[PDB]
Ligand binder design. Sequence first.
Ligand SMILES: O=c1cc(-c2ccc(O)c(O)c2)oc2cccc(O)c12
Length: 115
Amino acid sequence: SKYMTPMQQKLNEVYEAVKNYTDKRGRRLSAIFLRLPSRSELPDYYLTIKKPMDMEKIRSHMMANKYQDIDSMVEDFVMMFNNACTYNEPESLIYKDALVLHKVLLETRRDLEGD
Ligand SMILES: O=c1cc(-c2ccc(O)c(O)c2)oc2cccc(O)c12
């Protein structure tokens, strides 16, 4: 069935807002967050980070209707963004991008408060 419930539509719209956000110079900040590297590729991340998370995990939960509200999705984004900000240095760009997208997430939730 092609038609989404109101909640599915809202979930989808929040996700898409973070995925498609582009800054004033045309860069999609989400590109690096789509998929986390392997355990072999980033051993250090997996030793430090308790709950690994990337946007494909959030997308998979979403497409399996595993999020029953918007708060549950925000929780996983915040986890992802906090992980990036824990592992990477405060002066690094992935740290900074995670913060801008955190703002976009929240700004997108506020925009859609009525809907
Ligand atoms: O902290 C993260 C770091 C990386 C990452 C991606 C490509 C790289 O070349 C890298 O050095 C780190 O991907 C991620 C994807 C999702 C969530 C993350 O916190 C991360």
